[PDB]
Amino acid sequence: PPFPWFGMDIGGTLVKLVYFEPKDIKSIRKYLTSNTAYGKTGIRDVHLELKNLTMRKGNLHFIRFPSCAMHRFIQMCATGGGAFKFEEDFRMIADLQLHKLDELDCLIQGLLYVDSVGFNGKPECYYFENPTNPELCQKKPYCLDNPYPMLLVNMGSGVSILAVYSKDNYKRVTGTSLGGGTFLGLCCLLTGCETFEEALEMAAKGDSTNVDKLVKDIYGGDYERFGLQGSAVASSFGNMMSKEKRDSISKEDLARATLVTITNNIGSIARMCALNENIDRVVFVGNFLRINMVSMKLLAYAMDFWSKGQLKALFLEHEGYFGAVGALLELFK
Amino acid sequence: FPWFGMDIGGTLVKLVYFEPKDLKSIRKYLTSNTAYGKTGIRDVHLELKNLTMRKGNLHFIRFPSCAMHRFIQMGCATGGGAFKFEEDFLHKLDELDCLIQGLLYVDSVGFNGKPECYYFENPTNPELCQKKPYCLDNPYPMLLVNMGSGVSILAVYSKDNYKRVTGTSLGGGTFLGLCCLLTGCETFEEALEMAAKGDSTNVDKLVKDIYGGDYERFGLQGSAVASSFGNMMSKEKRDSISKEDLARATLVTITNNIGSIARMCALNENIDRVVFVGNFLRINMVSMKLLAYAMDFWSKGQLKALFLEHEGYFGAVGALLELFK
Secondary structure (H helix, E strand, C coil): CCCCEEEEEECCCEEEEEEEEECCCCHHHHHHHCCCEECCCEEECHHHCEEEEECCEEEEEEEEEEHHHHHHHHHCCEECCHHHHCCCHHHHCCCCCCCECCHHHHHHHHHHHHHHHCECCECCEEEEECCCCCCCCEEEECCCCCCCCEEEEEECCCEEEEEEEECCEEEEEEEECCCHHHHHHHHHHHHCCCCHHHHHHHHHHCCHHHCCEEHHHHHCCCEHHHCECCCCEEECCCCCCCHHHHCCCCHHHHHHHHHHHHHHHHHHHHHHHHHHHCCCCEEEECHHHCCCCHHHHHHHHHHHHHHCCCCCEEEECCCCCHHHHHHHHHCCC | CCEEEEEECCCEEEEEEEEECCCCCHHHHHHHCCECCCCCEECHHHCEEEEECCEEEEEEEEEEHHHHHHHHHHCCEECCCCCHHHCCCCCECCHHHHHHHHHHHHHHHCECCECCEEEEECCCCCCCCEEEEECCCCCCCEEEEEECCCEEEEEEEECCEEEEEEEECCCHHHHHHHHHHHHCCCCHHHHHHHHHHCCHHHCCEEHHHHHCCCEHHHCECCCCEEECCCCCCCHHHHCCCCHHHHHHHHHHHHHHHHHHHHHHHHHHHCCCCEEEECHHHCCCCHHHHHHHHHHHHHCCCCCCEEEECCCCCHHHHHHHHHHCC
16 A cells, blocks of 8 residues: 555544554654644654554554644545544645445454553553542553454444444444433533533532432431442432522533433443443443543442443543544555 | 231331231221221222132231331331331241242232233333233243342242343432432422423434434434433533433433343343332332333334233232231
8 A cells, every 4th residue: 555544533522533654664754753743733643652563563643633624634444423524625726535434343453453452552451549539549551452352332422232242343232321411411411511521520529418318318327138338329300400509500510410310320321331241341331431531430430330340441542533443454455 | 817928118208017807996996997097098909809828808008217207107118118116016038939929929929810021012112001911820930120229130940040140220219319419309200290291302412413314334213312411522412301301311312221131131141020119219200111111122123011910019019928927
């Protein structure tokens, strides 16, 4: 294949671009390498850069920028919903030759490829120890050298759970309609916020125990008969039919309760799927995790809760760029 | 020396009375009418006849908890509102044990020649929706989905052996709680009435909204919900919803989720008979049919949601059975 090897994930909002810079052999090459920011909008996440990679030896770069500056980009292999929309501009202005690729297959291929090459000597996978304890919480590396088989929980507006047995064998096991879209949708209705970033920032600061009814609220403490700790949620939003309780809540509390309800639910479903499929590595991905680490930490707590500590929620360092990586890999085909 | 059981639960009260056939004052006022005081009913259709317990008839009566003092003045119980009126009286029994014992008993004796259990066919299609009886001969093992403020799922292996396998915090309390915040309603009854008239498809994002129809690759029909409340981050979409739609979307979200959880539990526990009970099924049949649809959906038509004719009185019956101990 011929040089400038790119891969693109054009979403209706954010655009992800990955570029493999050949080491030790063209004005475009200098522009990318000599700049950390592009067009006063684009950003190049240097910390995600993969060095000494062999595809020839080179480095893999990760760049991102709003789908708005896509017109500027044109003036200066792809997947994503925004691929179609701009297919026109890609031809009218510059040269099209745009090969549309499936979002899911690109995600899987990219995810598996990055995990296989590692993160510059370190694992691509990680988890959280003591997720809900601000003072003890810690992101920890987890070597996932053989990801087969694994369960992939892809959280977008809704949630799809896939069982991955090989590069080309992944099937949807199940899913849930209570996902990121449910979180934002409810947050908009309950707090008047408008964006994901706003809702997540709110959730990170709130206290859901003001809106949710806890087990200890019913039994004064743990309910040993059911092996339920007093801190467990008995009923999500279960205190909200009481005017007195509503008088003590804040919008942040509502956002938090919404997020907690969704993450705890996903954890329960993912854990039962792991049990039924006999798989013990559950990896979580999706835009539902890209703005605030609060979501991952809550998913970490949920997986540990429902599994009784047997299963950890696993995450990937390059989440968000897998579709783009998958697109790039198609060039070699 | 009068046979009766009581379930004093916060608001509503359930009373079961075994009228002997062949303290006689009670044998009068009860048989004399079907209504008692301002709010008090006697579900005649649920009455079990020619029952051997001597032989007589088991009656089912219901009335508000506020009319409890009335009941007392005119003169074994369970429910979270028993020790209140404990002064005005009382042997309080465990809610869960009474529910199970009463449920198993009623199913064992049957409903006057007919099965106590039943399921639905084409539950969401009012033109084909038909109630079908189910013979739950030997109930062991079976899964019991008990829906209260939250949801508990129990595996029943025998009359004396059962355990909680799991549960979900998204239950009746979630439905009412969210409805109060989203619509300003105040009671479960009001919420359910609104939900029955709403359309959740204006609130939720459906699979067809994303793929223009079915999505074969995932075996997902276009009518399936892709994202609950998924259209609500759009100002233009929020402009099209009503309070009834919000209440319905809340109910559909909760019932669909419960169905999924119950289905996966059945799979993991290798138990195919799943029975649903709980005050969450208190008023009409909207929730029951939504749960029926959910079970069929998630199980791809392999499992049906099972319901019981005397749901709501099992706790009272369980209380009654304690007398013979």
